[PDB]
Design a binder for this molecule. Structure first.
Ligand SMILES: OC[C@H]1O[C@@H](O)[C@H](O)[C@@H]1O
Ligand SMILES: [Cl-]
Length: 140
């Protein structure tokens, strides 16, 4: 089972998610990211089970990353589902902020508003090694 699950918006956070994966693997963490570890079967169930298995939930907040979660009260959006799973399971949630604007809580479904209460890490292009070192300090 992975130490770290990486949750990301495919259309805007793919590159940072992949960069986080490489760095965390280099520092000895087992990482789940969909394009490497999601394999055959019903992907909804497999993705939720993979969130449940990982102690750490690394959430890539690229610009607009939570937009598709807004008004998604039937919880059809995959990132929304992954966040609710990490929250419900009491995972160590580590938001990574990359150009993301914090929305007002009331624009998000009630079942994920708590994600805004976790201490986040600002991604620094100019100081990436230091950013990675801070992420590692945050991981359990
Ligand atoms: O790929 C885009 C995001 O939703 C799911 O497909 C992945 O687990 C990732 O968090
Ligand atoms: Cl997505």
């Amino acid at each position: 089972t992975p130490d770290v699950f990486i949750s990301y918006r495919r259309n805007s956070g793919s590159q940072l998610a992949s960069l986080l994966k490489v760095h965390l693997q280099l520092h000895g963490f087992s990482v789940f990211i969909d394009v490497e570890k999601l394999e055959a079967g019903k992907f909804e169930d497999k993705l939720i089970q993979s969130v449940m298995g990982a102690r750490n939930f690394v959430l890539v907040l690229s610009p607009g990353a939570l937009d598709k979660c807004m008004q998604d009260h039937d919880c059809k959006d995959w990132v929304h589902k992954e966040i609710v799973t990490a929250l419900s399971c009491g995972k160590n949630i580590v938001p990574i902020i990359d150009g993301f604007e914090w929305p007002e809580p009331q624009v998000l479904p009630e079942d994920m508003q708590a994600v805004l209460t976790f201490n986040g890490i600002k991604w620094s292009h100019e100081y990436q090694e230091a950013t990675i070192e801070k992420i590692i300090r945050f991981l359990q």
